[PDB]
């Protein structure tokens, strides 16, 4: 039962959930990784990790991925959530120096992860392990694209740090541009490719239908997170949220901003259904009769299939995950799973 303010009947009726068969092993293996990389305290791992549903989120998204690819993605995605938590905590505690140093180390570790596998900062060491593993699946040109994209994500996190320190709420257009980076749209899009076992040529992944289907899938995920994470984020003095920019710059009430965010999320779905037809037509066209063609066709089709799976995985994740259950916290400003 999804709250009426958050319910999307089109997702429930037309985007049936999928789950990767490796998910049972994935859940425990990522929990063990969080424990052994010291990315969460042992008692917080035991009490909260499974309930945060991070592995479920990936296992409902990258269908068809090799077990080892899914494992590295899930470890990275759990790392990403812990990094969001650390970033938030550095902000709340005014640890500008610790954040700046961390920011620099992630930039460096991103380009040479193997050199950082045993760094003193467990968050940097965890990052490097997952990234080194992700760099092992596809050619160096894919690794360099992942790094280029994540360098941009790190700097968007830095911009968020400056905004919240200075109490600046981005304008709507400014936020929509920033949100494609803080949510890491293009990282999740990159990671479709090791999941289907094929680095896509630029001509293929920059095709207008592939690009637009990829964009809309991520816009939905980020803006649906905004809709669902708004209570926790208002309680935690987070300023980055489409609803908050609407209240601040467009003078909407809370109920009207929630309504406008809802409508924008709903439009993402029906825009995606239109372009999905074009992206799958393009997949069919790539099967020109040659071996390379059949391979590229299959990879594009699998990737567009997972762009669709992202809709249902993110939807149900926000109603299942303990990450957003702010009403159950004694201190609504400090989630119990964060290192405070």
Ligand X SMILES: O=P(O)(O)C(O)(Cc1cccnc1)P(=O)(O)O
What does the binding site for ligand X look like in residue numbers (CB under 6 A)? 80, 84, 182-184, 225, 229, 323
Q: Does 71 bind Mg ion (CB under 5 A)?
A: no
By residue count, the chain amounts to 340
Sequence-distant (≥ 6) Cβ neighbours of residue 126 within 8 angstroms:
33, 37, 38, 39, 75, 79, 82
Q: Is 58 exposed, middle or buried (0-12, 13-18, 19+ CB in 10 A)?
A: buried
Q: Tell me the C-alpha distance between 65 and 302, whole Å.
A: 10
Q: How far is the CB of 285 from Mg ion (least distance, A)?
A: 37
Q: Tell me the C-alpha distance between 217 and 272, whole Å.
A: 7
- Letters for 79-108 (x = contact with Mg ion by CB under 5 A, - = none) are -----x------------------------
Q: How far is the CB of 229 from ligand X (least distance, A)?
A: 3
Q: How far is the CB of 186 from ligand X (least distance, A)?
A: 12
Q: How far is the CB of 83 from Mg ion (least distance, A)?
A: 9
183 binds, options ligand X, Mg ion, none, Cβ within 5 to 8 A by partner type: ligand X
| Binder of Mg ion out of 55, 143, 229, 306 (CB under 5 A) | 229
Nearer CB in complex with ligand X: 238/278: 238
- Letters for 44-63 (x = contact with Mg ion by CB under 5 A, - = none) are --------------------
Q: Tell me the C-alpha distance between 125 and 116, whole Å.
A: 6
Nearer CB in complex with ligand X: 50/84: 84
Residues 129-188 that bind Mg ion (CB under 5 A): none
Nearer CB in complex with ligand X: 84/278: 84
Q: How far is the CB of 149 from Mg ion (least distance, A)?
A: 16
Chain position whose Cβ is nearest to Mg ion: 229
Q: How far is the CB of 337 from Mg ion (least distance, A)?
A: 12
Give yes or no for a contact between 242 and 226, defined as CB atoms under 8 angstroms apart: yes
CA angle 311, 313, 319 (to 5 degrees): 110
Q: Tell me the C-alpha distance between 186 and 203, whole Å.
A: 16
| Residue where the block lists tokens 């954040």 | 99
SS3 266: helix
Nearer CB in complex with ligand X: 184/247: 184
Q: Tell me the C-alpha distance between 8 and 20, whole Å.
A: 23
3-state DSSP: the chain helix, strand, coil percent, rounded to 5? 75, 0, 25
295 binds, options Mg ion, ligand X, none, Cβ within 5 to 8 A by partner type: none
Q: How far is the CB of 98 from ligand X (least distance, A)?
A: 19
Q: What would the two tokens of residue 67 be? A: 């077990």
Q: What would the two tokens of residue 223 be? A: 């803006």
Chain position whose Cβ is nearest to ligand X: 229
Residues that bind Mg ion (CB under 5 A): 84, 225, 229
């Amino acid at each position: 039962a999804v709250p009426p303010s958050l319910r999307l009947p089109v997702i429930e009726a037309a985007f049936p959930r999928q789950l990767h068969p490796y998910w049972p092993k994935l859940q425990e293996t990522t929990r063990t990784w969080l424990l052994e990389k010291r990315l969460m305290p042992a008692d917080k791992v035991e009490e909260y990790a499974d309930g945060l549903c991070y592995t479920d989120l990936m296992a409902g998204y990258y269908l068809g991925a090799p077990d080892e690819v899914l494992q590295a993605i899930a470890d990275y995605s759990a790392w990403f959530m812990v990094w969001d938590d650390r970033h938030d905590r550095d902000i709340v505690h005014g640890r500008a120096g610790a954040w700046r140093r961390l920011r620099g180390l992630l930039h460096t570790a991103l380009d040479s992860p193997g050199d950082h596998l045993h760094h003193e900062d467990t968050l940097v060491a965890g990052f490097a392990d997952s990234v080194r593993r992700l760099y092992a699946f596809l050619p160096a040109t894919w690794n360099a694209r992942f790094a280029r994209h994540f360098h941009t994500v790190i700097e968007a996190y830095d911009r968020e740090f400056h905004n919240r320190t200075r109490g600046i709420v981005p304008g709507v257009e400014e936020y929509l541009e920033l949100r494609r980076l803080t949510f890491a749209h293009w990282i999740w899009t990159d990671l479709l490719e090791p999941s289907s076992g094929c680095e896509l040529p630029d001509a293929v992944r920059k095709h207008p239908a592939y690009r637009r289907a990829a964009l809309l899938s991520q816009e939905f995920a980020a803006w649906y997170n905004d809709l669902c994470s708004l209570p926790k984020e208002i309680a935690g003095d987070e300023v980055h949220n489409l609803g908050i920019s609407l209240i601040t710059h467009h003078s909407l009430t809370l109920e009207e901003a929630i309504g406008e965010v809802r409508r924008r999320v709903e439009e993402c779905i029906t825009e995606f259904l239109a372009v999905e037809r074009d992206a799958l037509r393009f997949a069919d066209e790539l099967a020109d009769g040659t071996v390379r063609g059949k391979e590229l066709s299959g990879a594009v089709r699998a990737n567009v299939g997972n762009m669709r799976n992202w809709f249902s995985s993110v939807y149900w994740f926000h109603h299942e995950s303990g990450r957003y259950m702010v009403d159950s916290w004694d201190d609504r400003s400090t989630p119990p799973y964060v290192n405070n």
